[PDB]
Design an enzyme around this catalytic site. Sequence first.
Site, PDB file in Angstrom:
ATOM      1  N   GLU A  12       0.822  -1.210   0.000  1.00  9.82           N
ATOM      2  CA  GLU A  12       0.000   0.000   0.000  1.00  9.82           C
ATOM      3  C   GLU A  12       0.869   1.279   0.000  1.00  9.82           C
ATOM      4  O   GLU A  12       1.469   1.609   1.014  1.00  9.82           O
ATOM      5  CB  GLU A  12      -0.903  -0.048   1.248  1.00  9.82           C
ATOM      6  CG  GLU A  12      -1.875   1.100   1.394  1.00  9.82           C
ATOM      7  CD  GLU A  12      -2.713   1.274   0.149  1.00  9.82           C
ATOM      8  OE1 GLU A  12      -3.313   0.247  -0.298  1.00  9.82           O
ATOM      9  OE2 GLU A  12      -2.747   2.440  -0.369  1.00  9.82           O
ATOM     10  N   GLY A  13       0.956   1.986  -1.130  1.00  7.29           N
ATOM     11  CA  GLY A  13       1.767   3.192  -1.184  1.00  7.29           C
ATOM     12  C   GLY A  13       0.988   4.436  -0.822  1.00  7.29           C
ATOM     13  O   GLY A  13      -0.191   4.373  -0.457  1.00  7.29           O
ATOM     14  N   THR A  14       1.642   5.586  -0.937  1.00  6.94           N
ATOM     15  CA  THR A  14       1.024   6.894  -0.593  1.00  6.94           C
ATOM     16  C   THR A  14      -0.380   7.243  -1.152  1.00  6.94           C
ATOM     17  O   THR A  14      -1.264   7.708  -0.383  1.00  6.94           O
ATOM     18  CB  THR A  14       2.007   8.041  -0.959  1.00  6.94           C
ATOM     19  OG1 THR A  14       3.181   7.914  -0.149  1.00  6.94           O
ATOM     20  CG2 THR A  14       1.410   9.418  -0.587  1.00  6.94           C
ATOM     21  N   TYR A  15      -0.535   7.104  -2.474  1.00 10.18           N
ATOM     22  CA  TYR A  15      -1.793   7.385  -3.182  1.00 10.18           C
ATOM     23  C   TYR A  15      -2.516   6.128  -3.654  1.00 10.18           C
ATOM     24  O   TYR A  15      -3.501   6.222  -4.379  1.00 10.18           O
ATOM     25  CB  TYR A  15      -1.557   8.319  -4.409  1.00 10.18           C
ATOM     26  CG  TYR A  15      -0.863   9.590  -4.023  1.00 10.18           C
ATOM     27  CD1 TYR A  15       0.516   9.741  -4.183  1.00 10.18           C
ATOM     28  CD2 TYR A  15      -1.583  10.632  -3.425  1.00 10.18           C
ATOM     29  CE1 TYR A  15       1.160  10.908  -3.813  1.00 10.18           C
ATOM     30  CE2 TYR A  15      -0.944  11.803  -3.043  1.00 10.18           C
ATOM     31  CZ  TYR A  15       0.420  11.941  -3.248  1.00 10.18           C
ATOM     32  OH  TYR A  15       1.016  13.121  -2.832  1.00 10.18           O
ATOM     33  N   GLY A  16      -2.058   4.949  -3.262  1.00  5.49           N
ATOM     34  CA  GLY A  16      -2.686   3.737  -3.785  1.00  5.49           C
ATOM     35  C   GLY A  16      -1.859   2.487  -3.659  1.00  5.49           C
ATOM     36  O   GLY A  16      -0.739   2.487  -3.126  1.00  5.49           O
ATOM     37  N   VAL A  17      -2.414   1.395  -4.154  1.00  2.00           N
ATOM     38  CA  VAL A  17      -1.755   0.121  -4.003  1.00  2.00           C
ATOM     39  C   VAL A  17      -0.877  -0.074  -5.242  1.00  2.00           C
ATOM     40  O   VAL A  17      -1.232   0.353  -6.333  1.00  2.00           O
ATOM     41  CB  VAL A  17      -2.810  -0.994  -3.770  1.00  2.00           C
ATOM     42  CG1 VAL A  17      -3.948  -0.708  -4.665  1.00  2.00           C
ATOM     43  CG2 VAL A  17      -2.262  -2.388  -4.047  1.00  2.00           C
ATOM     44  N   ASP A 125       6.821  15.500  -0.336  1.00  2.00           N
ATOM     45  CA  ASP A 125       6.643  14.354   0.558  1.00  2.00           C
ATOM     46  C   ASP A 125       7.747  13.318   0.438  1.00  2.00           C
ATOM     47  O   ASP A 125       7.512  12.089   0.556  1.00  2.00           O
ATOM     48  CB  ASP A 125       5.286  13.687   0.315  1.00  2.00           C
ATOM     49  CG  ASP A 125       4.890  12.739   1.433  1.00  2.00           C
ATOM     50  OD1 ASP A 125       5.018  13.048   2.634  1.00  2.00           O
ATOM     51  OD2 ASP A 125       4.489  11.608   1.196  1.00  2.00           O
TER      52      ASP A 125
END
Length: 277
Positions: A12-17, A125
């Site tokens: 699971e990354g910052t804006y989505g999988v 970020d």
Amino acid sequence: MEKYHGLEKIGEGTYGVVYKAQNNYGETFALKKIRLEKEDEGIPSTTIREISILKELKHSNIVKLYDVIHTKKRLVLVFEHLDQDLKKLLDVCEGGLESVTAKSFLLQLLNGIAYCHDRRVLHRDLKPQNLLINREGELKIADFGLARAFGIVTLWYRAPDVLMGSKKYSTTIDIWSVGCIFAEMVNGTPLFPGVSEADQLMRIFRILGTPNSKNWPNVTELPKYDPNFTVYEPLPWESFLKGLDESGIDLLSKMLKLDPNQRITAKQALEHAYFKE
Ligand SMILES: CC(C)[C@H](CO)Nc1nc(Nc2ccc(C(=O)O)c(Cl)c2)c2ncn(C(C)C)c2n1
């Protein structure tokens, strides 16, 4: 879904999988499926345009964006795949990285940042989770430019002016995060691991000094500046840094200037004596 197969969830990354996958030609890619907080809202055309311009970012230390797949309240970004992130490497390196490695990663990070900054692309970020590393030791940055498209929360890499409510466009914000990442790579451990906005400022000020109108003119103009902040004197750099020679500390002291107008730029950092050695 541009015909990919063998979708393997990396996590699971910052804006989505993110999934590792192969195309129908059998080459390896990383797919980022954008998480939409409001499924019904739809992605406006201006946003698709702001992401697609990032295909123009072609630099050996920037993750390459190959494709932007937009079908039916579903948004997938096709990137090159890298095998690890700096966070996962730092997790098994007791005490931090060897000096030669940290210098090699910092050099690559600043090169990729210099390149984006010259094009007025900000990250905002930066964190070890988005500094991706291949087996040849090459570092590439992920998610550069995505904050302009998209806007629990890690505060550890955020500049004190941003924490006090600054909102202006500025390249200085990424340089603070580099200074925090540099120290993390040499110490092992994060330099300012705050648990909230107020504690994050306190962790910073306890090490680098509480700001005031003399060491940061115009600090009182920030929306969340607080005239009651506890007053802390700066510590000597040698006392919370280890495994860094004189030049390294010097370079680090320039990235961690509290006043953004005095903060070193990416390209200035690349000229610093630390890298001639
Ligand atoms: C947390 C996840 C989603 C990750 C790490 O930042 N994002 C993430 N990890 C990648 N690579 C890996 C592969 C395996 C592992 C492993 O766990 O062994 C890790 Cl950490 C990273 C990756 N490659 C291209 N991208 C683009 C999509 C830019 C990637 N984003």
